[PDB]
Design an enzyme around this catalytic site. Sequence first.
Site, short mmCIF file in Angstrom:
data_model
loop_
_atom_site.label_atom_id
_atom_site.label_comp_id
_atom_site.label_asym_id
_atom_site.label_seq_id
_atom_site.Cartn_x
_atom_site.Cartn_y
_atom_site.Cartn_z
N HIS A 261 5.80 13.18 -1.90
CA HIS A 261 5.32 11.96 -2.52
C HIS A 261 3.77 11.82 -2.53
O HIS A 261 3.13 12.13 -1.53
CB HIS A 261 5.94 10.77 -1.81
N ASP A 262 3.20 11.35 -3.65
CA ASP A 262 1.74 11.30 -3.85
C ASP A 262 1.00 12.54 -3.33
O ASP A 262 0.16 12.46 -2.42
CB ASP A 262 1.15 10.05 -3.20
N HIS B 247 -3.98 7.60 -5.96
CA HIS B 247 -2.94 6.75 -5.43
C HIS B 247 -3.35 5.35 -5.88
O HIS B 247 -4.10 4.67 -5.19
CB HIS B 247 -2.83 6.86 -3.90
N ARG C 216 -0.05 11.78 -9.48
CA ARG C 216 -0.41 10.51 -10.12
C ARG C 216 -1.85 10.57 -10.56
O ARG C 216 -2.73 11.03 -9.81
CB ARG C 216 -0.23 9.32 -9.18
N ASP D 35 6.92 11.78 2.40
CA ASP D 35 5.54 11.63 2.85
C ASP D 35 5.32 12.62 3.99
O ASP D 35 6.27 12.96 4.69
CB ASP D 35 5.22 10.20 3.31
O1 LIG Z 1 5.05 1.96 -6.38
C1 LIG Z 1 4.67 3.30 -6.66
C2 LIG Z 1 5.31 3.72 -8.01
O2 LIG Z 1 5.80 2.56 -8.72
C3 LIG Z 1 6.34 4.86 -7.91
O3 LIG Z 1 7.32 4.90 -8.96
C4 LIG Z 1 7.03 4.88 -6.56
O4 LIG Z 1 7.99 5.92 -6.51
C5 LIG Z 1 6.04 5.24 -5.49
O5 LIG Z 1 6.80 5.54 -4.30
C6 LIG Z 1 4.82 4.26 -5.44
O6 LIG Z 1 4.70 3.55 -4.20
#
Ligand SMILES: O[C@H]1[C@@H](O)[C@@H](O)[C@@H](O)[C@@H](O)[C@@H]1O
Length: 301
Positions: A29-30, A79, A66, A280
């Site tokens: 994630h991210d 982020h 992102r 994460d």
């Molecule tokens: O709010 C954001 C976003 O809208 C993503 O779609 C989500 O998967 C993430 O985890 C993030 O925190």
Amino acid sequence: DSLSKSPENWMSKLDDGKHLTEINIPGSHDSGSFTLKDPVKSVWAKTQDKDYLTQMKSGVRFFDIRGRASADNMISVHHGMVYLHHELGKFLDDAKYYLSAYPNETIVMSMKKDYDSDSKVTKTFEEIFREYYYNNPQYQNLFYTGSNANPTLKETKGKIVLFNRMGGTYIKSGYGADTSGIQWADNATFETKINNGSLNLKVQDEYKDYYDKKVEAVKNLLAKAKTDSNKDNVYVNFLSVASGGSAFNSTYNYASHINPEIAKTIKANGKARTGWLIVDYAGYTWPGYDDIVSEIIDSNK
Ligand SMILES: O[C@H]1[C@@H](O)[C@@H](O)[C@@H](O)[C@@H](O)[C@@H]1O
């Protein structure tokens, strides 16, 4: 000898004919938030401590990228409002290198607009990505360009598969690569048909959840994948959760416990289908508790 012990190329050890959909994949994630040093920004905007190449070396193949258009030809990794100190080029160049050194892996790359473009920007995010990255000469041979909605591992070996979170797009290869894109439900567990109905995407993305709920949502979707033999279903659930203020509360303090907890479950379940799990602080180990990326890797035959 378990696949874990060789995470630089566990996909090379898999039957070529399996659809990426079928493969249990570790995701971060991210993915690029590893560059953050600021202690206060880090409790909420930081989600990894390992850079891209190391993430890959540790076996992660789903990268949640992102971005933000900074200029008519550059997408900054982000982020949200927070700039993560490198452009998308940094990731793709890192992906190219790794993919050559390990030509039998495939990478799925999620692409999402996370923040508004600079005032000086002319084009759309999708246009900038499509026309300066997806089909920029420097990365010919890098992206998947087929016409199969449900690509086989064999088909994608040595390539990046686009996972399209940008809205509609003129890119014609990848998951959700059409003018409809993917219908993403905010803070939810949902299903939606993607790629012209040829794929049923299933997501647990309840990021506003508290601890009990999150673990339950993760495990509920996890259990559904355990049963589902359907190659036309995709499973993506984020173990990750939006922090609180404070640091307590921080992203890491959640991952530090959610990851091991889901890790113990998966190992107990033997070898079984899990879907793609997005975490994460991938590659982060806590002695005594199981590694989520390892048990994800080990649950594939
Ligand atoms: O709010 C954001 C976003 O809208 C993503 O779609 C989500 O998967 C993430 O985890 C993030 O925190």
